[PDB]
XYZ file of C-alpha atoms in Angstrom:
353
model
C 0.000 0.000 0.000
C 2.980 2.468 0.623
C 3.549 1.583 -3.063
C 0.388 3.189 -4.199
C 0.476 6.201 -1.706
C 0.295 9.464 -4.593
C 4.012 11.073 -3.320
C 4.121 14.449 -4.088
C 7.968 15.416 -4.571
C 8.275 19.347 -4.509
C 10.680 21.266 -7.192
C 14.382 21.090 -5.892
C 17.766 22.268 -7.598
C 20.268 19.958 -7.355
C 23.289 20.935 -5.886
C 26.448 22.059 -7.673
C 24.399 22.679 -10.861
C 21.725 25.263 -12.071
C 19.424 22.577 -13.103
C 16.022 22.354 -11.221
C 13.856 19.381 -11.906
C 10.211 18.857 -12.058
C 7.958 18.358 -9.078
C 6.127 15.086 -9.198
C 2.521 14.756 -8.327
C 0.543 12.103 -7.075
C 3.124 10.307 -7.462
C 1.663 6.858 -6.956
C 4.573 4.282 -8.064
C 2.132 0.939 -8.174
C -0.475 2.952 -10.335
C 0.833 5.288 -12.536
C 3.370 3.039 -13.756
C 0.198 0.817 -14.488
C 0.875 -2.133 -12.175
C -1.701 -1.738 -10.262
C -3.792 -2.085 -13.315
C -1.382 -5.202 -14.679
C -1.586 -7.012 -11.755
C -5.519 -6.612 -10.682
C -3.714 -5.994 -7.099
C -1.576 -3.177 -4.646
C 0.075 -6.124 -3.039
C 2.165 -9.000 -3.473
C 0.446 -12.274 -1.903
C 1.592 -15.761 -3.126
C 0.705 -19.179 -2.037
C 2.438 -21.972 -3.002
C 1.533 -25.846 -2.440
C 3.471 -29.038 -3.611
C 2.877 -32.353 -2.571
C 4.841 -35.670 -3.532
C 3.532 -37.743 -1.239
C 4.227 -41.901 -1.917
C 2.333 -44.618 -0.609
C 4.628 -47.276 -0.498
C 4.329 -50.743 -1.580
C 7.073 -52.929 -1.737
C 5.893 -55.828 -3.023
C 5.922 -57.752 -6.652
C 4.126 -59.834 -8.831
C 6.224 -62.541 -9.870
C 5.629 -64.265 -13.241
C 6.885 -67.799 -13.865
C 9.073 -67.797 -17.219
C 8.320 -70.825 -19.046
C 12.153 -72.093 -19.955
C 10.557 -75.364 -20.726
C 10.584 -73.785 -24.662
C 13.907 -74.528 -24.797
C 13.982 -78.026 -23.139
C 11.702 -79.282 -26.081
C 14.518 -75.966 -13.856
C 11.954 -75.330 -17.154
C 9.785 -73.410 -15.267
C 12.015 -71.757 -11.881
C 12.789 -68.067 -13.189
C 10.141 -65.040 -12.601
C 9.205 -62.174 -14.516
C 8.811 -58.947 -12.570
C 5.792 -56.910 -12.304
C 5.855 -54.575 -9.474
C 3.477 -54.092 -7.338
C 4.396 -50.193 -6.809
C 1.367 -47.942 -5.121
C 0.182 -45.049 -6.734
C 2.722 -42.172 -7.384
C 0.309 -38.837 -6.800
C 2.068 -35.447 -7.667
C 0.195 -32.197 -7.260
C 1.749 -28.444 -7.797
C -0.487 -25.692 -7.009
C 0.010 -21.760 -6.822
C -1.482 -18.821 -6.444
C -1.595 -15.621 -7.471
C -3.944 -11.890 -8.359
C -2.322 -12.275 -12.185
C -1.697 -15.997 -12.656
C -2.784 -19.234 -11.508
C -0.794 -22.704 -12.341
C -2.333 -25.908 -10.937
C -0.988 -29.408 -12.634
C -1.815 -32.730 -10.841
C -0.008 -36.245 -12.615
C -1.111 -38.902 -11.834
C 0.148 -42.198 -12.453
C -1.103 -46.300 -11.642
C 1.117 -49.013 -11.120
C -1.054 -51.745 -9.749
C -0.460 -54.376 -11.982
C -0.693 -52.345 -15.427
C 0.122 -48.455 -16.279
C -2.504 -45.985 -16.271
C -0.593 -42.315 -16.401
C -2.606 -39.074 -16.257
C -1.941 -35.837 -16.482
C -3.881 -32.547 -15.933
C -1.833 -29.150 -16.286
C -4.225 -26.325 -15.392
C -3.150 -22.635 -16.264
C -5.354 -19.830 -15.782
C -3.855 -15.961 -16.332
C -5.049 -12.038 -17.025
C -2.876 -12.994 -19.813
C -4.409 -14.505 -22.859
C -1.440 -16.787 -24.115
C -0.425 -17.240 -20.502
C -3.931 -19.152 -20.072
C -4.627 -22.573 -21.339
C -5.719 -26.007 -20.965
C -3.402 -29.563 -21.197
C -4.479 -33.210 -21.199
C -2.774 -36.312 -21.418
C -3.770 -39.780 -20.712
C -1.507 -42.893 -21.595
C -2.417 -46.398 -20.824
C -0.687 -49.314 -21.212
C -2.474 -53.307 -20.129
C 0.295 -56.089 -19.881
C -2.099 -58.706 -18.634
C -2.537 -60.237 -22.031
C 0.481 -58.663 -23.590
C 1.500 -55.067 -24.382
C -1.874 -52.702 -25.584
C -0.878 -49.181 -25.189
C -3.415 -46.670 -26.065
C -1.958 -42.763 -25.459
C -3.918 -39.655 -26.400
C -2.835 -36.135 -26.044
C -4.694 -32.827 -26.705
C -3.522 -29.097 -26.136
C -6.031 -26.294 -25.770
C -3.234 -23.536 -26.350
C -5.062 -19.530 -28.278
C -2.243 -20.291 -30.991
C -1.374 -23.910 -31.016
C -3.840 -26.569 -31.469
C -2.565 -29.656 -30.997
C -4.488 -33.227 -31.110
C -2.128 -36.001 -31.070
C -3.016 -40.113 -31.033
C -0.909 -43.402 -30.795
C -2.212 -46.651 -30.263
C 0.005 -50.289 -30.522
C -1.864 -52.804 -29.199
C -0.604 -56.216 -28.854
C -3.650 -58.843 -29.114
C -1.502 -61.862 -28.322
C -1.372 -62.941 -32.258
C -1.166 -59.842 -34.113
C 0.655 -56.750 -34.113
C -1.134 -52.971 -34.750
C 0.105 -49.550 -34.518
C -1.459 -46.065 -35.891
C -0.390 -42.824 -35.447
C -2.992 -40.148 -36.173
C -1.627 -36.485 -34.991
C -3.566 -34.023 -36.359
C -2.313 -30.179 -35.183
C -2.265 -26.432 -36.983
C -0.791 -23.205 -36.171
C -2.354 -20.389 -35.876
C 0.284 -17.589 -36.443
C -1.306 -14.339 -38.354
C 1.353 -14.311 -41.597
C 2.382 -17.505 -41.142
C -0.711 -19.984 -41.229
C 0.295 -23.864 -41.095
C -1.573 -27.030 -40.620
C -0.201 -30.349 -41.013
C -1.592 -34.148 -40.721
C -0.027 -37.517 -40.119
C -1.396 -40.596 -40.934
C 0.953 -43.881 -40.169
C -0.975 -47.133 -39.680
C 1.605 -50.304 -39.325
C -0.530 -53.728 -39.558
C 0.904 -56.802 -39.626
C -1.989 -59.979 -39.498
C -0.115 -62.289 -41.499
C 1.712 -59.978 -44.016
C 2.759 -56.556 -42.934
C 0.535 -53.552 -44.669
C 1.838 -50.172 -43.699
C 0.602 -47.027 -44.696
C 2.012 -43.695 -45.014
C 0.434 -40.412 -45.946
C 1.750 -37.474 -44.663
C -0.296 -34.268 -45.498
C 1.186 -30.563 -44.990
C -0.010 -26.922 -45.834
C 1.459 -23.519 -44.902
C -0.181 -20.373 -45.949
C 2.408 -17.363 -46.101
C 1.948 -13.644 -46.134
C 4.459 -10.756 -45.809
C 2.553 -7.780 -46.793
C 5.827 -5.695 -45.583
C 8.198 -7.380 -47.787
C 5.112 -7.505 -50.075
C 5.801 -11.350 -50.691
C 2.687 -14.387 -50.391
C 3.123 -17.601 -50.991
C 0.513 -20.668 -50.286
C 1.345 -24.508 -50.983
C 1.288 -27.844 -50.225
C 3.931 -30.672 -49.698
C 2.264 -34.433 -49.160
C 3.721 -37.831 -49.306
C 1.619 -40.962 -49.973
C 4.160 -44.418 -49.357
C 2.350 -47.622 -50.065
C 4.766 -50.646 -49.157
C 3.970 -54.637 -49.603
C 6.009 -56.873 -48.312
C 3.910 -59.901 -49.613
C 5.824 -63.486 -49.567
C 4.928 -63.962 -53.610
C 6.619 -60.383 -53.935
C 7.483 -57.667 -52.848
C 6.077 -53.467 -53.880
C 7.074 -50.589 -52.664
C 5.356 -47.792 -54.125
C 6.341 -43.953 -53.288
C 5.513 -40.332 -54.930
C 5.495 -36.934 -53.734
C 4.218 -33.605 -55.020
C 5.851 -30.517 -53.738
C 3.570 -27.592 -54.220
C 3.426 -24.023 -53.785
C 2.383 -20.830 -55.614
C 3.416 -17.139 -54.682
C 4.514 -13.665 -55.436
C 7.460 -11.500 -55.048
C 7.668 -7.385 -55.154
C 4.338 -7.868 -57.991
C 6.406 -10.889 -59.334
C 5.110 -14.163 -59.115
C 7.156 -16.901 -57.828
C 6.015 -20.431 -59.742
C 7.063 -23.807 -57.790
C 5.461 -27.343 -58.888
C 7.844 -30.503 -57.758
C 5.963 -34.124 -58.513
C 7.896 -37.264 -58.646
C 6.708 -40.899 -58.656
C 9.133 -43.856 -57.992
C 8.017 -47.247 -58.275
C 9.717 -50.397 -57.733
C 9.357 -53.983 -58.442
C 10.926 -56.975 -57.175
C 10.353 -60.907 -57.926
C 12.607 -64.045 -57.855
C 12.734 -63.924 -61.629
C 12.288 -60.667 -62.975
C 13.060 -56.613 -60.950
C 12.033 -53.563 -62.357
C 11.868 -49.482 -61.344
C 11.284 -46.520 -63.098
C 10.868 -43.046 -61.270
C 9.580 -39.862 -63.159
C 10.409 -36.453 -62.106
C 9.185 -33.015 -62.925
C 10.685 -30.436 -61.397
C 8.797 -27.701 -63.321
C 9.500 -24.624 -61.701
C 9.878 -21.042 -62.605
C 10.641 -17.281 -61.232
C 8.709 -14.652 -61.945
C 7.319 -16.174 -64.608
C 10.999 -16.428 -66.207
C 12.860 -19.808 -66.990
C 10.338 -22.208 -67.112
C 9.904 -25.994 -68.045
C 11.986 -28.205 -65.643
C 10.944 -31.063 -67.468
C 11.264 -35.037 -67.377
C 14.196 -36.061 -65.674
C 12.709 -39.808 -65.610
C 14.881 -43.053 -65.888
C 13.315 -46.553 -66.579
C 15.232 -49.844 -66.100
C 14.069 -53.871 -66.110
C 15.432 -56.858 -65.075
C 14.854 -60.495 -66.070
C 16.139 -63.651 -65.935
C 15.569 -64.183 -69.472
C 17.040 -60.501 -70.616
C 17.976 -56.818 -69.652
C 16.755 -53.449 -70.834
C 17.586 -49.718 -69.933
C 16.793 -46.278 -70.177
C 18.061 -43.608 -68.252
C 17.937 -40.301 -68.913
C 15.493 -39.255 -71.200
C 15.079 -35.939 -70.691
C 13.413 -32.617 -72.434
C 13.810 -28.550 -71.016
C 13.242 -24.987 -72.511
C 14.277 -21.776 -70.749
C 13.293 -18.582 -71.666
C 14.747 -15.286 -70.279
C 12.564 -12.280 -70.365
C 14.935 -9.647 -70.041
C 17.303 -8.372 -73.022
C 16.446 -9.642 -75.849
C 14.481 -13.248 -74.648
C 17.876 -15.231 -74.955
C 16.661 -19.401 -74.541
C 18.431 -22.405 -73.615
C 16.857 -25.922 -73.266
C 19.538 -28.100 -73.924
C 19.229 -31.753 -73.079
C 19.736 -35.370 -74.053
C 17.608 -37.261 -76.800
C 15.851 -40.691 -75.704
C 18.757 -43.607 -75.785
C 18.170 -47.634 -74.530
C 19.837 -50.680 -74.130
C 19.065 -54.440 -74.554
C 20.876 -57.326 -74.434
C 19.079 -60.699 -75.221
C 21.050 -64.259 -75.761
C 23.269 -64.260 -79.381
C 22.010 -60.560 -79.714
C 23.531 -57.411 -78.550
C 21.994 -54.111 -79.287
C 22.740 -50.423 -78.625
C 21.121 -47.786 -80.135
C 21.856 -44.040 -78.350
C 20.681 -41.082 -79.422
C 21.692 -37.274 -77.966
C 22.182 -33.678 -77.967
């Protein structure tokens, strides 16, 4: 309260010198320097409580490990699952301009049930905000974990989800994390998708999915686009395909000049006992305001049999034009040119420049 008492200070000349400074006024310190305001308060109390308090419990569960596997003592060694009490954990404070409260929680019974609850509450908007997280994890009947996570942050929004569960025969795992940013200029939002499943022959699946949307209206440049990945992979016991392609996308502008970006591939390969194959096409078509253009099939194609081989590399085709001077070009680049071989025959035909 002496801190927001309105001082007046009277006009005084300092000594030695002819200057005479201004008297202050009301001179409240905690208010007129806005604290008082900030803070919701013309005080300083704070209360803090933490507790890490352990009920103990000693014992175990002790699982018999079947060694009699490898006699096809057999059946005299244990597996350890404690038998731990719960482990409680609680922070708590106080305060006129923020509040923090988190409590964890975590189970060790027989299995693993963790919990956690962070609790933040502020005058400030960013400084206010909401966390969750639950993992659990049953070993009864083999590992099953099962852990979610979600954020309720102004500018971050994240949701977040993993799952391998272990049903005693078969093996699954998906990841689904799904979370965007919320920045003004800089807008984002990406999206993963990975989903591992193995009943008798492993299928996995990946797609990963991304956007940004940009703005700099002081350096006058915007660009929007969107990178994404799709994998397909099969790891069959006939054969075996692995499939990939990506597209890297975006479109902006620079100082009123736009700035052109395309970038798709797609690689496929093949494999078998008899015969292998994979080709991969490219286009890296691209271009700067709106000047050298065409980035054009880079592609490559090549087979393998028992019975013969074939190849062709580097096929390729590109025409850039400048747009200042005089609109000087350049698109030099190979011609098609292959490769076979076959029993008795041998035959190379190339063609370039």
């Amino acid at each position: 309260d002496f801190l927001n008492i309105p001082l007046t200070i009277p006009e005084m000349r300092l000594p030695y010198t002819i200057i005479t400074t201004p008297p202050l006024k009301d001179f409240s310190l905690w208010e007129k320097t806005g604290l008082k305001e900030f803070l919701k308060t013309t005080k300083q109390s704070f209360d803090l409580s933490v507790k890490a308090q352990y009920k103990k419990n000693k014992h175990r569960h002790s699982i018999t490990n079947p060694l009699a596997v490898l006699c096809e003592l057999c059946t005299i060694s244990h597996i350890f699952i404690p038998a731990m009490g719960n482990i409680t954990y609680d922070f708590s404070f106080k305060s006129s301009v923020i509040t923090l409260n988190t409590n964890a929680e975590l189970f060790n019974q027989s299995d693993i049930v963790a919990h956690l609850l962070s609790s933040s509450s502020s005058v400030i908007d960013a400084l206010q905000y909401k966390l969750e997280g639950t993992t659990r994890l049953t070993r009864k009947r083999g590992l099953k974990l099962a852990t979610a996570l979600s954020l309720s942050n102004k500018f971050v929004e994240g949701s977040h989800n993993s799952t391998v569960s272990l049903t005693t025969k078969n093996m699954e795992v998906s990841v689904a994390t799904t979370t965007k940013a919320q920045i003004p200029i800089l807008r984002m939002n990406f999206k993963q998708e990975l989903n591992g499943n193995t009943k008798s022959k492993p299928t996995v699946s990946s797609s990963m999915e991304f956007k940004y949307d940009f703005n700099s209206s002081m350096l006058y440049s915007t660009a929007k686009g969107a990178v994404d990945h799709k994998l397909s992979l099969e790891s069959l016991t006939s054969y075996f395909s692995i499939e990939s392609s990506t597209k890297g996308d975006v479109k902006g502008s620079v100082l009123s000049r736009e700035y052109s970006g395309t970038i798709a591939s797609e690689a496929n390969t093949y494999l078998n006992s008899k015969s292998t194959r994979s080709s991969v096409k490219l286009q890296g078509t691209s271009k700067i305001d709106d000047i050298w253009n065409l980035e054009v099939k880079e592609n490559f194609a090549g087979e393998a049999t028992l019975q013969r081989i074939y190849s062709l590399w580097e096929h390729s085709t590109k025409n850039h034009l400048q747009l200042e001077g005089l609109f000087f070009t350049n698109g030099e680049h190979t011609s098609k040119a292959t490769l076979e071989l076959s029993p008795w025959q041998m035959s190379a035909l190339v063609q370039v420049h």
